């Protein structure tokens, strides 16, 4: 019913002048490639840009970056009308202007700097009144098309004289900034972002629905993670994204107010968020305001939490507010905010994976002229355990470096601090090398969630167990119905005991690869020691970030390290682990100091043990002449590389009771 209309979705191609559809739709709409389309959005707007194809598009959702989307006064979810519009004629005169707030500080001629680079061989269809963004000179510039000759919309051709006077246009009310915290600004946090998104989607963008309805719509949204994971952003952006009024509550701020005035604030906090509703009240650094754990010692520290819990209930479904809190971990927060009616929806944000950090890194360089030798992916690679902040700060450092070298030293000619300068000012792969080898690479590490990369290629011999695990996992994850035709239910865990350097680990990380499910490597030394004292509570937390990161396979290497608390605790959270969910559990030199209970059912009821020393030499020199296991292959790669520096091709020089 009404084919020409489709639901706006985020864009894959960040290029302003393009909207991409799915092929079947485009044929249904007699649309080709270079095809120029017309777009009628909300508030009576029209945005004529170019349409393309896209395999991951929806047969009814038109992908489109925020520019083309704000130029329609549309949010993500609203549906627009597309219509082929090939009757556009090469402009003649394109009189434009910069929104006075993206230019405050840049001197010189904009045109030459941002305009020309922008249009040169693009022919970007443009329509009178469109606000488009240009990233150059190490920042962002918003330009408003004031008057276009082939009116309304024309195609900026090479012969279309593009005028630019000198009276930056004041930013009109409704024309929200494009420099605004957006979805496109958050990277690496895909799957979980996607979760915040649906929770609010309904109550936040479809208000009335919760009037003609009587259903419990989340109110409190808690975000977990370590400082710099990007909660604020993910927050300010989901609000800035769905047209909600965003009202912030900086936790340290709310404490730095006279003993009492504190309250009044939180109250106005909600008293103002309940005004412009839909609205998201974001409590930043909550663990500072409401940490009623064993740090709760105060005649006023207690009144505050109350006052907030008195409001974290006071809000009715009709209020149209979704309160979002950002704490660090289950224990930083008061166990009373967990009540069902307050902050009941946890969303774990975590450390960005290999790909993440890249996106992230990419996201913060969308302005600086990176060099041809800047392999951002590289930067992403050697940075193993960083968070957003760490990664962003890096781009600033690395960047400032450029500016600290080339430019001001060249002060000698003079101080032309202008556009053309920053514009051509490049940041080479040596600027990141400097930024990285600093006093900032020291990132606050913790337990990471990655997607196993190693397959069965890095494990030779013992192919006995290999064809076994694939049956307790490679079948209940891809073949769900084949496991309801027998009656029996899958195992919750398994155990791998034996001598060191045997293969257990490289196997546990492997088994997950064949299921594309994450992994969690909780080393033995580690829970007890390097984490937090008396942390039988830290253990339940592990499972939280475990069952949540599903599909996944858990693995506690070196279980012999430790019926005591820790063990018994890992055992308790082992039974309460919703079996009917993707939460596998591996185990790990001393089958004696091992509590038999761990051997017992409902836990590690599976018992395994670890030709071999002939093929484990092939998968140990693959990426490495043609004539403990690795303790030798390494003493060779060395005497082999030390023999060259002194022709890349050594060895002679290197040379059951329990079962």
Ligand X SMILES: Nc1ncnc2c1ncn2[C@@H]1O[C@H](COP(=O)(O)OP(=O)(O)O)[C@@H](O)[C@H]1O
- What are φ and ψ of residue 629, in 5° steps? -40, -40
Token pair of 11 as six digits: 């864009």
Pairing of strands 220-224, 245-250: unpaired
- Residue 629 binds to ligand ANP (criterion: CB under 6 A): yes
Work out how close the CB of 556 gets to ligand ANP at its nearest, in angstroms, rounded to a whole number: 10
User: From the annotation, which residues make up the binding site?
Assistant: 227-233, 328, 364, 501-506
Contact track, its own copies, 327-346, x by CB under 8 A: ---------x--xx---xxx
488's tokens = 């029996």
Residue 473 CA to its chain's centroid (Å): 28
Burial class (CB in 10 A: 0-12, 13-18, 19+), 456: middle
Residue 588 touching ligand ANP (CB under 6 A): yes
The interface mask with its own copies, positions 443-482, x = CB under 8 A, is: x-x-------------------------xx--x---x--x
Residue 445 interacting partner from ligand ANP, ligand X, its own copies, none (CB closer than 5 to 8 Å by kind):
its own copies
Element (H or E) spanning 343, and its range? Answer: strand 343-348
**Binding test (CB under 8 A) with its own copies, winner from 24, 86, 158, 252:** 252
Is 636 near ligand ANP (CB under 6 A)? no
- What is the spatial distance between Cα 243 and Cα 240, in angstroms, rounded to a whole number? 6
Please give the Cα distance from 137 to 124 (Å, whole number).
21
Torsions phi, psi of 485, nearest 5? -105, 5
Q: Could you list the residues known to form a binding site for ATP, using ranges.
A: 227-233, 328, 364, 501-506
> How far, in whole angstroms, is CA 188 from its chain's centroid?
3
Tell me how far apart the alpha carbons of residues 383 and 493 are, in angstroms, rounded to a whole number. Answer: 33
Stretch that binds ligand ANP, among 77-85, 269-277, 310-318, 494-502 (CB under 6 A): 494-502
Phi, psi of 274 (to 5 degrees): -85, -5
- In this structure, the dihedral spanned by the alpha carbons of residues 314, 329, 203 and 2, taken in order and rounded to 10 degrees, is 180
Nearer to ligand ANP, 176 or 514 (CB): 514
Within residues 222-281, the interface with ligand ANP by CB under 6 A covers: none
163, HSE (Cβ side, Cα atoms, 13 Å) = 12
The reply to whether 228 sits near ligand X by the rule CB under 6 A is: yes
Burial of 18: CB neighbours in 10 Å, binned 0-12, 13-18, 19+ = buried
Of all helices (H) and strands (E), which one includes residue 28?
helix 23-28
> CA 514: distance to chain centroid?
24
Residue 30 Cβ vs its own copies, minimum distance, rounded to whole Å: 20
What is the 3-state secondary structure of 358-425?
Answer: HHHHHHCCCCCEECCCCCHHHHHHHCCCCCHHHHHHHHHHHHHHHHHHHHHHHHHCCCCCCHHHHHHC
286: contact with ligand X by CB under 6 A: no
600-619 binders of ligand ANP (CB under 6 A): 601, 616, 619
> For residue 269, which of 285, 257, 254 has the smallest C-alpha distance?
254
352-381 residues in contact with ligand X (CB under 6 A) are 352, 360, 363
Report what 10 binds from ligand X, its own copies, ligand ANP, none; CB cut-off 5-8 Å by kind.
none
383 makes contact with ligand X (CB under 6 A): no
The one among 41, 98, 137, 187 contacting ligand X by CB under 6 A: 187
Minimum CB separation from its own copies for residue 554, in Å?
15
Q: Considering only residues 461, 498, 524, 591, which one is a binding residue for its own copies as defined by CB under 8 A?
A: 524
The residue from 336, 385, 630, 635 that contacts ligand ANP (CB under 6 A) is 630
Q: Which of 159, 623, 626, 656 binds its own copies (CB under 8 A)?
A: 623
Q: Does 227 bind ligand X (CB under 6 A)?
A: yes
Give yes or no for residue 230 binding ligand X (CB under 6 A).
yes
* Binding piece for its own copies, criterion CB under 8 A, among 23-31, 49-57, 147-155, 296-304: 296-304
Give CA–CA dist 365/370, Å, rounded.
Answer: 7
Q: What residue ranges bind ligand ANP (CB under 6 A)?
A: 458-460, 498, 500-506, 557, 588-589, 601, 616, 619-620, 629-630
Q: What residue ranges bind ligand X (CB under 6 A)?
A: 186-189, 227-233, 326, 352, 360, 363, 388-389, 392
């Amino acid at each position: 019913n009404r084919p020409n209309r489709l639901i706006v979705d985020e864009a894959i191609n960040e290029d302003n002048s393009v909207v991409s559809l799915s092929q079947p739709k485009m044929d249904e709409l007699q649309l080709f490639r270079g095809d120029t389309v017309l777009l009628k959005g909300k508030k009576r707007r029209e945005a004529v840009c170019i349409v393309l194809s896209d395999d991951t598009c929806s047969d009814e959702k038109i992908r489109m970056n925020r520019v083309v989307r704000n130029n329609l006064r549309v949010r993500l979810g609203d549906v627009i009308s597309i219509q082929p519009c090939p009757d556009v004629k090469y402009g003649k005169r394109i009189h434009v202007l910069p929104i006075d707030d993206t230019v405050e500080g840049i001197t010189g001629n904009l045109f030459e700097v941002y305009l020309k680079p922008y249009f040169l061989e693009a022919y970007r269809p443009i329509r009178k009144g469109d606000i488009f963004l240009v990233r150059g000179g190490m920042r962002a510039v918003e330009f408003k098309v004031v008057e276009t000759d082939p009116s309304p919309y024309c195609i900026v051709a090479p012969d279309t004289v593009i005028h630019c006077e000198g009276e930056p246009i004041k930013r009109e009310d409704e024309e929200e900034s494009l420099n605004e915290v957006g979805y496109d600004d958050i990277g690496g946090c895909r799957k979980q972002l996607a979760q915040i998104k649906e929770m609010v989607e309904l109550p936040l963008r479809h208000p009335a629905l919760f009037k003609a309805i009587g259903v419990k719509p989340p109110r409190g949204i808690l975000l977990y993670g370590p400082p710099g994971t990007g909660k604020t952003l993910i927050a300010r952006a989901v609000a800035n994204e769905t047209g909600a009024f965003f009202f912030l509550i900086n936790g340290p701020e709310i404490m730095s107010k006279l003993a009492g005035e504190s309250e009044s604030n939180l109250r106005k906090a909600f008293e103002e968020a309940e005004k412009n509703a839909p609205a998201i009240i974001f409590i930043d650094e909550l663990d500072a305001i409401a940490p009623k754990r064993e740090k709760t010692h105060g005649e006023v520290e207690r009144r505050i939490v109350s006052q907030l819990l008195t409001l974290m209930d006071g809000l009715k479904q009709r209020a149209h507010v979704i309160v979002m809190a950002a704490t660090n971990r289950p224990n930083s927060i008061d166990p009373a905010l967990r009540r069902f009616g307050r902050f009941d929806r946890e969303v774990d944000i975590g450390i960005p994976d290999a790909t993440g950090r890249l996106e992230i890194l990419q996201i913060h360089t969308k302005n600086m002229k990176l060099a041809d030798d800047v392999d951002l992916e590289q930067v992403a690679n050697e940075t193993h355990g960083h968070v957003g902040a760490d990664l962003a700060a890096l781009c600033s450092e690395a960047a400032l470096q450029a500016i600290r070298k080339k430019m001001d030293l060249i002060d000698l000619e003079d101080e032309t601090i202008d556009a053309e300068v920053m514009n051509s000012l490049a940041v080479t792969m040596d600027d990141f090398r400097w930024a990285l080898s600093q006093s900032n690479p020291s990132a606050l590490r913790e337990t990471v969630v990655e997607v196993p990369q190693v397959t069965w290629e890095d494990i030779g011999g013992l192919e006995d167990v290999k064809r076994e695990l694939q049956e307790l996992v490679q079948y209940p994850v891809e073949h769900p119905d084949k496991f309801l035709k027998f009656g029996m239910t899958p195992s919750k865990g398994v155990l791998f005991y034996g001598p060191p350097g045997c293969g257990k680990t490289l196997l546990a990380k492997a088994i997950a690869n064949e299921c594309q499910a994450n992994f969690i490597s909780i080393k033995g030394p580690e829970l007890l020691t390097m984490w937090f004292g008396e942390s039988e509570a830290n253990v339940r937390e592990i499972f939280d970030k475990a069952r949540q990161a599903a599909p996944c396979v858990l693995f506690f290497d070196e279980l012999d390290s430790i019926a005591d608390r820790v063990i018994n605790q890992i055992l308790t959270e082992m039974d309460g682990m919703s079996t009917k969910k993707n939460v596998f559990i591996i185990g790990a030199n001393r089958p004696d100091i091992i509590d038999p209970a761990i051997l017992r059912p409902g836990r590690l009821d599976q018992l395994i043990y670890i030709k071999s020393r002939v093929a484990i030499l092939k998968a140990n020199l693959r990426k490495s002449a043609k004539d403990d296991l690795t303790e030798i292959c390494q003493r060779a790669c060395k005497l082999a590389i030390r023999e060259s520096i002194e022709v890349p091709e050594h060895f002679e020089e290197a040379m059951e009771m329990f079962a």
